[PDB]
Amino acid sequence: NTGEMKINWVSRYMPLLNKIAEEYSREKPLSGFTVGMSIHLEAKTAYLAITLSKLGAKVVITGSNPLSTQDDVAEALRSKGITVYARRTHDESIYRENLMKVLDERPDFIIDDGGDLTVISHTEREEVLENLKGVSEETTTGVRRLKALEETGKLRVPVIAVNDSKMKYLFDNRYGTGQSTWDAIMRNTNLLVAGKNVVVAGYGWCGRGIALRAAGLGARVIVTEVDPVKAVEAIMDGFTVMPMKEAVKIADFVITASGNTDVLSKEDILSLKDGAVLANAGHFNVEIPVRVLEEIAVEKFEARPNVTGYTLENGKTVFLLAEGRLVNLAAGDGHPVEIMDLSFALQIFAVLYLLENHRKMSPKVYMLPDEIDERVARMKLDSLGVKIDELTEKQRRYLRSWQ
């Protein structure tokens, strides 16, 4: 069926996950443990779930899928004994309920998205903390929220921040996040990017990728920031940096990539050109203040699929993509297959590290242990047939000396 075909495609090109299954599927180290997951459901993340199941885990998943798609992939997962709640998750109260359903299964380990399950676990479903042994979190927003639980002394389980990885810097995110973001914008609008002014708010991993891709498509790029180091980076990449209040005066597209709230103010929005297009690439739908748009608009209308027009008190109309939600995951090509294979390998090993070591770990956010980065790098090399050098004893002693 179509769901099995989507999974079969990705399985061909996930050599690390396939090697992990080869290495551990007989031993079944996760037998008798439940792994709860919050993911965007699609064939790649389905393969992560499948690999966890091959390792013996009971896997229970909620999908953030406001797109109303990948049902075929959900049905394929059900046929393999994996529990998936992803339908109707455009409605936030349904996504929330589906998280509650994952927590009803009393997971031993959580692979979280944006920290959603873990935060609920510490705020409203504290009975799950008895059984919860560890959390793996991959996103910046997630790490931020979990670090805040830590700093306020509310965190109760060890968390591994997998976005630590030495291998984030490995790939250029212009062909991951940048490419998938511009593909989505181009599909929703059919507008030219070349020769346009594109404003990117935030110049971290996500924003830089979006900015570089926009420049590759021939746009004039303007970057906004609050961190002076990041602003200097953007300048040294050839971009213009200025405050948002000035940038909005000339923007054709404004893309938020900050992980922050209210990156446009009311006054910024009233400065936009007639026909400006706004989109969000951050985790939550508050970067572009949709509630402010809805409050100040004289008229609201659906201009085309996935595009909301807001006509302002000043007579101008601005357009919001995807209700200000994350724009680039709907089509299921957020990142290349082999990049997700790498990321998922790191997450599987993070879960196995927590299985082995959680009793020894404090309720703190840890950086990804270096041994995991090295393990996965070595497995990648082996899968490519690449051999490297080994230090001699003379060399080891040289490197530990002050000669």
Ligand X SMILES: NC(=O)C1=CN([C@@H]2O[C@H](COP(=O)(O)OP(=O)(O)OC[C@H]3O[C@@H](n4cnc5c(N)ncnc54)[C@H](O)[C@@H]3O)[C@@H](O)[C@H]2O)C=CC1
202 binds ligand X (CB under 6 A): yes
**Which single residue brings its beta carbon nearest to ligand X?**
204
* Angstrom distances, CA of residue 162 to CA of 3, 171, 304, 367: 28, 15, 38, 7
**Contact with ligand X (CB under 6 A): which of 225, 252, 268, 373?**
225
6 binds its own copies (CB under 8 A): yes
DSSP secondary structure, 33-70, as one string: -EEEEEE--SHHHHHHHHHHHHTT-EEEEEE--TT---
**Contact with Cl ion (CB under 5 A): which of 88, 220, 266, 273?**
220
216 binds Cl ion (CB under 5 A): yes
Nearer to Cl ion, 204 or 216 (CB): 216
User: Which of ligand X, Cl ion, its own copies, none does residue 255 bind (CB under 5 to 8 Å by kind)?
Assistant: none
User: Which of Cl ion, its own copies, ligand X, none does residue 283 bind (CB under 5 to 8 Å by kind)?
Assistant: ligand X
Nearest 10 degrees: Cα torsion 351, 355, 357, 359: 130
Contact segment (CB under 8 A) with its own copies among 77-85, 92-100, 128-136, 392-400 equals 392-400
Distance between CA 310 and CA 287 in Å, rounded?
17
Query: Hey, how many other C-beta atoms are within 10 angstroms of the C-beta on 121?
Result: 26
CB of 341 closer than 8 Å to CB of 16: yes
Nearer to ligand X, 55 or 255 (CB): 255
267 binds its own copies (CB under 8 A): no
Nearer to Cl ion, 216 or 363 (CB): 216
Q: How far is the CB of 95 from ligand X (least distance, A)?
A: 16
**β partners of residue 279:** 255
224 binds ligand X (CB under 6 A): yes
Find the radius of gyration of the CA atoms of the chain.
22
Residues whose CB falls within 8 Å of the CB of residue 198, separated by 6 or more in sequence, listed in order? 211, 214, 219, 220, 221, 222, 251, 252, 253, 255
Distance between CA 378 and CA 236 in Å, rounded?
33
183 binds Cl ion (CB under 5 A): no
141 binds ligand X (CB under 6 A): yes
**Contact with ligand X (CB under 6 A): which of 184, 251, 257, 321?**
257
**β partners of residue 38:** 62
Distance between CA 47 and CA 377 in Å, rounded?
20
260 binds ligand X (CB under 6 A): yes
User: Which of Cl ion, ligand X, its own copies, none does residue 275 bind (CB under 5 to 8 Å by kind)?
Assistant: its own copies
Q: How far is the CB of 294 from ligand X (least distance, A)?
A: 21
Q: How far is the CB of 333 from its own copies (least distance, A)?
A: 5
CB of 149 closer than 8 Å to CB of 155: yes
Per-residue x/- mask for its own copies, residues 233 to 252, rule CB under 8 A? x-xxxxxxxxxx--------
**Contact with ligand X (CB under 6 A): which of 45, 179, 317, 328?**
328
64 binds ligand X (CB under 6 A): no
Binding positions for substrate: 113, 138, 168, 172
Q: How far is the CB of 249 from ligand X (least distance, A)?
A: 16
CB of 371 closer than 8 Å to CB of 153: no
170 binds its own copies (CB under 8 A): yes
Phi-psi region of 273 (alpha: psi -120 to 50; beta: other; left: phi over 0): beta
CB of 253 closer than 8 Å to CB of 198: yes
User: Site residues (CB under 6 A) for ligand X?
Assistant: 139-141, 177, 201-207, 224-227, 230, 257-260, 263, 281-283, 326, 328, 334, 389, 395
